[PDB]
Amino acid sequence: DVPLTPSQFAKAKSENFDKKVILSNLNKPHALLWGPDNQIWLTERATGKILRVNPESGSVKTVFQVPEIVNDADGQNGLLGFAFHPDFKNNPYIYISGTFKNPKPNQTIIRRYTYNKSTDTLEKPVDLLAGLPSSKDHQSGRLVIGPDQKIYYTIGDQGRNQLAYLFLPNQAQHTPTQQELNGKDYHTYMGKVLRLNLDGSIPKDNPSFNGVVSHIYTLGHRNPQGLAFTPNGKLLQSEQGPNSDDEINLIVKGGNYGWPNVAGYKDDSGYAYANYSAAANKSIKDLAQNGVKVAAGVPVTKESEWTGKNFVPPLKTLYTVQDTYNYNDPTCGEMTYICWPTVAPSSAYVYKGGKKAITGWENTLLVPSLKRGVIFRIKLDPTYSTTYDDAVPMFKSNNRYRDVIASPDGNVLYVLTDTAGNVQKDDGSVTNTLENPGSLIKFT
Amino acid sequence: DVPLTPSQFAKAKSENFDKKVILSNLNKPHALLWGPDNQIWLTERATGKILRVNPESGSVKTVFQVPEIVNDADGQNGLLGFAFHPDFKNNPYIYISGTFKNPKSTDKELPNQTIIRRYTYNKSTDTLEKPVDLLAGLPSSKDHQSGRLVIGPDQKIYYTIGDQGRNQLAYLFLPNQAQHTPTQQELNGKDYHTYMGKVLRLNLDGSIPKDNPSFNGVVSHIYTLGHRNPQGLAFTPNGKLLQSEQGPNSDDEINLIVKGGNYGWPNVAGYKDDSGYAYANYSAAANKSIKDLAQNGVKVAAGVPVTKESEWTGKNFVPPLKTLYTVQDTYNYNDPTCGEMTYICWPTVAPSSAYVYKGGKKAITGWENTLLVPSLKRGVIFRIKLDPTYSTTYDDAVPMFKSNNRYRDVIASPDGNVLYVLTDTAGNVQKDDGSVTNTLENPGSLIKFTYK
Ligand SMILES: O=C(O)c1cc(C(=O)O)c2c(n1)C(=O)C(=O)c1cc(C(=O)O)[nH]c1-2
Ligand SMILES: O=C(O)c1cc(C(=O)O)c2c(n1)C(=O)C(=O)c1cc(C(=O)O)[nH]c1-2
Ligand SMILES: [Ca+2]
Ligand SMILES: [Ca+2]
Ligand SMILES: [Ca+2]
Ligand SMILES: [Ca+2]
Ligand SMILES: [Ca+2]
Ligand SMILES: [Ca+2]
Numbered sequence: 001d002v003p004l005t006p007s008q009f010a011k012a013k014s015e016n017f018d019k020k021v022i023l024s025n026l027n028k029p030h031a032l033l034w035g036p037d038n039q040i041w042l043t044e045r046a047t048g049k050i051l052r053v054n055p056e057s058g059s060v061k062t063v064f065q066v067p068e069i070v071n072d073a074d075g076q077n078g079l080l081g082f083a084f085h086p087d088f089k090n091n092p093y094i095y096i097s098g099t100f101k102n103p104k105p106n107q108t109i110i111r112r113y114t115y116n117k118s119t120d121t122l123e124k125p126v127d128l129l130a131g132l133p134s135s136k137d138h139q140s141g142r143l144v145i146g147p148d149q150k151i152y153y154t155i156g157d158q159g160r161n162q163l164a165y166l167f168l169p170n171q172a173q174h175t176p177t178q179q180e181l182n183g184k185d186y187h188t189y190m191g192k193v194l195r196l197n198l199d200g201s202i203p204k205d206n207p208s209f210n211g212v213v214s215h216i217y218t219l220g221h222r223n224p225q226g227l228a229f230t231p232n233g234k235l236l237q238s239e240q241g242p243n244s245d246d247e248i249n250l251i252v253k254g255g256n257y258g259w260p261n262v263a264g265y266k267d268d269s270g271y272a273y274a275n276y277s278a279a280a281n282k283s284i285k286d287l288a289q290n291g292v293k294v295a296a297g298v299p300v301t302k303e304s305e306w307t308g309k310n311f312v313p314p315l316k317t318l319y320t321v322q323d324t325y326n327y328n329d330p331t332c333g334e335m336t337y338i339c340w341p342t343v344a345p346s347s348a349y350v351y352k353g354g355k356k357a358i359t360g361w362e363n364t365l366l367v368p369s370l371k372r373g374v375i376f377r378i379k380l381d382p383t384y385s386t387t388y389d390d391a392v393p394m395f396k397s398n399n400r401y402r403d404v405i406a407s408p409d410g411n412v413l414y415v416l417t418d419t420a421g422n423v424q425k426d427d428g429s430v431t432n433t434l435e436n437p438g439s440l441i442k443f444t
Numbered sequence: 445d446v447p448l449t450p451s452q453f454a455k456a457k458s459e460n461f462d463k464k465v466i467l468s469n470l471n472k473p474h475a476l477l478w479g480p481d482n483q484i485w486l487t488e489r490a491t492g493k494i495l496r497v498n499p500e501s502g503s504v505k506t507v508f509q510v511p512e513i514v515n516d517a518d519g520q521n522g523l524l525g526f527a528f529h530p531d532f533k534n535n536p537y538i539y540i541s542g543t544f545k546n547p548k549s550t551d552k553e554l555p556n557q558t559i560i561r562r563y564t565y566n567k568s569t570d571t572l573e574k575p576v577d578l579l580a581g582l583p584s585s586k587d588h589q590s591g592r593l594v595i596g597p598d599q600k601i602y603y604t605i606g607d608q609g610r611n612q613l614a615y616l617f618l619p620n621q622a623q624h625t626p627t628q629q630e631l632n633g634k635d636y637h638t639y640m641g642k643v644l645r646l647n648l649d650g651s652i653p654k655d656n657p658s659f660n661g662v663v664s665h666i667y668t669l670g671h672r673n674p675q676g677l678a679f680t681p682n683g684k685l686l687q688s689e690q691g692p693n694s695d696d697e698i699n700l701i702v703k704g705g706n707y708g709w710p711n712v713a714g715y716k717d718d719s720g721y722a723y724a725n726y727s728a729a730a731n732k733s734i735k736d737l738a739q740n741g742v743k744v745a746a747g748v749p750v751t752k753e754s755e756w757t758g759k760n761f762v763p764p765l766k767t768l769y770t771v772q773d774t775y776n777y778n779d780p781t782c783g784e785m786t787y788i789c790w791p792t793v794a795p796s797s798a799y800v801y802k803g804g805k806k807a808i809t810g811w812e813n814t815l816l817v818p819s820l821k822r823g824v825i826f827r828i829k830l831d832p833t834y835s836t837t838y839d840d841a842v843p844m845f846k847s848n849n850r851y852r853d854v855i856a857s858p859d860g861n862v863l864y865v866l867t868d869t870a871g872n873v874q875k876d877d878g879s880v881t882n883t884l885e886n887p888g889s890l891i892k893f894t895y896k
Contacts, residue, residue, distance in 0.1 A: 002718050002754040234835075252831050255838075266840070267770055268446050269719065304446040311839050312831075316763075320717055322772045381702050381762075385684075385835060388705075389761045390716070 026438030080141025108132035128200030138223035157191035207254030226348025331428030354410030450878030456843035524591025578650030607641035657704030676798025693740035804860030818851035
């Protein structure tokens with residue numbers, strides 16, 4: 001898609017909705033879910049707390065706090081995954097993923113907790129899968145259980161080939177060896193959508209890569225923070241691209257999603273793969289022009305020059321631009337990245353409507369934007385095969401939307417907001433003064 | 445997708461297949477189908493003939509010649525639609541569409557109508573009898589007629605009807621109707637002028653299906669709108685409707701036909717990316733003596749209104765699964781390696797058809813869930829892979845059977861180890877070096893390609 005202008009975003013205030021803050025003092029609220037008790041359960045990434053807010057009153061109780069969660073003030077790590085069991089009534093289990101120190105600097109662990117209604121807390125912990133990659137960047141961590149009862153988990157590319165991890169060789173394309181996988185060497189589990197049994201083991205019907213079946217379901221992802229199933233069993237996803245091509249992808253078994261060789265469509269438009277991990281002298285500066293304009297010494301590969309297999313394109317990109325696009329926009333003062341042709345999707349929620357269904361939102365995908373302070377409504381067709389028209393921005397505000405769910409009746413939306421950060425105001429300029437820090441707000 | 449280079453096309457020779465010309469010098473062979481009698485049936489667009497060929501022996505027989513078929517030697521009109529009834533044994537019906545004089549016209553060009561008609565096949569007499577007009581009075585012209593006709597899993601006739609070439613070449617100043625929809629009043633008087641650049645869905649008796657999508661309040665024969673020249677149309681085993689379509693100077697498409705979907709033509713070619721194309725409305729040109737620069741709307745003569753794809757106020761837009769090809773605004777549409785024929789070097793392939801490879805007891809390795817797209821101007825058969833559910837494409841369109849021929853249509857034998865293709869009798873094609881020729885290796889031919 002084509003970038004919306006600062007003007008277009010500013011006029012997307014969603015006047016037709018009543019805004020109402022439920023919670024205010026929250027420490028990096030990450031994910032929120034509609035609990036099996038008709039209560040909203042959210043998480044705090046830094047602290048590892050699992051709250052339970054009464055959606056009708058706003059009363060909150062700290063159910064449990066995941067112990068030893070590591071969190072870098074400058075990072076995206078901490079308590080990440082968070083899901084319930086499909087049949088909670090009969091199987092009261094909660095699934096999470098978090099950043100924990102690795103005695104042999106950190107690892108990522110997918111852990112199952114056992115819910116005790118009597119004491120109303122989490123007990124009997126079992127590690128489903130550990131030794132997973134960890135860094136301060138692009139951890140992703142969306143954890144959902146599918147219609148097949150499998151754990152679907154997104155694990156980012158750890159931020160390799162950019163910023164702090166500029167010269168680390170991106171492994172979104174890398175797959176494990178039978179020998180490594182046999183030694184629980186999950187170093188390849190970067191930029192992947194994992195699919196695992198409820199005991200952390202490898203599903204026997206998982207896709208094969210290099211003659212090897214592992215926990216990998218799909219590959220070639222950057223920072224896929226959005227992951228949600230549709231009423232008909234399809235897997236929609238939202239992902240963060242580089243200076244461009246944030247995506248809405250349809251996850252399919254064994255599908256290769258191109259990162260880092262391809263950002264968005266394979267069109268050689270506005271992005272080229274500049275591999276800094278192969279640069280001669282590692283002193284070379286990343287010009288931050290999305291690979292379109294690079295410093296001498298860095299091997300650049302056109303997406304069209306990629307010799308990949310099973311490449312699956314996005315259903316939509318926010319946004320795709322041409323090579324003439326200016327990645328240094330003066331409108332964003334110093335924070336030049338906020339003026340990049342992206343929206344920074346923090347999640348992906350599939351709106352199931354209800355007896356109070358918002359009119360015209362049938363088969364829509366809600367995608368919250370961090371940097372743009374909007375929540376996108378992406379309409380798809382009844383079969384969830386394609387998108388109709390564009391991504392319509394909603395609830396414009398000086399806030400960084402982190403997640404979003406809807407009530408059963410489906411007339412009220414609950415969104416989480418970043419405790420702090422940079423967001424684009426009504427003009428093209430930027431600010432770090434967030435209107436609603438670490439909050440759970442409700443739109444009716 | 446990004447355009448292949450002449451050299452990449454050139455090496456797509458396909459040595460892994462045996463090339464064997466069955467027939468030659470057919471009169472503008474258009475569509476071929478695999479008959480129930482395990483014999484190959486093909487159509488001759490100009491003459492209106494229906495030929496039955498013996499796959500192994502090559503014996504031809506003119507089974508039937510559709511009477512009054514109108515065809516301009518220079519146009520894309522004539523006998524178009526050609527389909528058998530799914531259960532041909534119980535229901536021996538052949539469905540066609542063709543250009544016929546319209547006694548009820550009021551124009552120069554626009555003197556013809558397109559008619560979807562049913563024929564009954566007589567076993568012992570071996571010819572088509574008892575003709576039944578199902579839907580007549582359909583738009584007609586020399587350009588973009590499309591005319592693919594398939595019978596859907598729902599027992600409905602699905603038909604592609606091009607935008608009639610409006611807004612280009614000989615119809616440059618005619619207002620494109622791809623996005624237009626019929627009023628009830630028009631539907632009552634059987635006025636189907638708006639049936640342009642559409643995928644029609646109609647009952648077998650030719651009436652409007654009660655469960656057809658609505659467009660601006662009216663349920664008509666329209667299933668999907670906003671098409672240019674959709675020559676490819678084929679159902680996948682799981683009921684999905686795949687389609688191939690010709691774009692302007694760029695953005696040929698592989699589309700997934702979705703009920704009520706707006707495929708955007710002419711305001712959008714390929715993705716809504718505002719890249720390489722722009723909608724220049726020549727019918728609204730200030731001074732109409734102006735010329736069409738043929739630079740895909742990026743650069744147009746003075747006086748012609750131009751609307752960006754992003755400025756398009758349309759709804760239900762469905763983007764293509766793949767574009768052949770998409771390029772940026774800096775693209776040079778005046779490519780000197782094609783010289784006098786500046787159109788063949790454009791980032792397009794002129795997809796001539798769309799065939800779903802169903803495999804079989806001798807299926808080709810790795811061809812599961814593929815879509816064979818014959819290219820006219822590139823002399824290749826693109827093999828496009830999709831996932832098992834036919835939801836997405838895998839990788840790019842791979843060129844096959846490179847040759848100085850205009851591939852028109854393609855099918856596979858039931859066992860799946862041989863491909864049968866039709867080539868144009870005359871026309872332009874890109875040579876291995878990127879330049880143009882009209883010297884076709886196998887003019888109006890029926891070629892069989894057998895696998896390893
Ligand atoms: O393209 C951008 O301008 C931009 C902005 C932001 C942002 O504002 O937080 C992120 C990203 N990109 C991004 O790629 C990304 O993976 C990301 C993660 C986060 C986050 O807060 O967890 N922000 C962002
Ligand atoms: O862009 C092109 O270079 C190009 C080439 C050709 C061709 O080679 O026939 C056609 C077209 N475009 C085209 O747009 C088109 O609708 C078309 C129809 C036909 C045909 O033979 O029926 N060719 C072509
Ligand atoms: Ca980004
Ligand atoms: Ca991708
Ligand atoms: Ca791209
Ligand atoms: Ca064309
Ligand atoms: Ca289209
Ligand atoms: Ca376009």
